[PDB]
Amino acid sequence: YDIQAWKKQCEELLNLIFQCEDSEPFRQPVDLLEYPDYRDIIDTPMDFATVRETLEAGNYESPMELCKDVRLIFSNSKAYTPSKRSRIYSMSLRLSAFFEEHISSVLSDYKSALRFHKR
Ligand SMILES: Cc1ccc(OCC(=O)N2CC[NH+](C)CC2)cc1
Structure with missing residues (x-):
């Protein structure tokens, strides 16, 4: 029923993601000196x-x-990946599965709490 609960739930999930080695390439913006054409694609x-x-x-x-x-x-x-077998893309696929597994209940609980608020 708590319309605000998602925020702390997202903080905790973000903490888990930051602790995870697979989030390393995604913890800060992509380095434009390292990938000079990044903004031509993204x-x-x-x-x-x-x-x-x-x-x-x-x-x-x-x-x-x-x-x-x-x-x-x-x-x-x-x-941005040049191939499906790249190191950074492989890390993003695993991290995405982890994120989706945990965010599903956060979204469901929030949407249910909002529906209850408008019952
Ligand atoms: C955001 C992004 C997505 C995929 C990429 O695929 C290439 C890759 O993972 N590497 C090649 C270059 N190494 C220095 C690091 C490993 C690169 C960047």
Whole structure:
């Protein structure tokens, strides 16, 4: 029933993701000196520090908005990878499975709490 519970649930999930070795390439923006053509392929860079900062600033209204930004991290990895067998893309696939496994109840609980609020 708690309409606000998603925020701490997302903070905790972000903490687990930061602790995970698979999040290393995604903890800060992609290095434009290392990948000089990055912005010719990727329109909207996104990373987990930006997600965490947006959440802490009180700039997400729902866990759906947070989930859209996290999914953008993974779609940017899929778009920039030169191959399906690349190291960073392989890490993003595992991290995405972990994120999706944990975010499902956060989204369901929030949507259920909002429906209860409007019963
Ligand atoms: C965001 C992104 C996504 C996929 C990439 O695929 C190539 C890769 O994973 N590497 C080749 C270059 N090494 C220095 C690191 C390993 C690279 C960057």
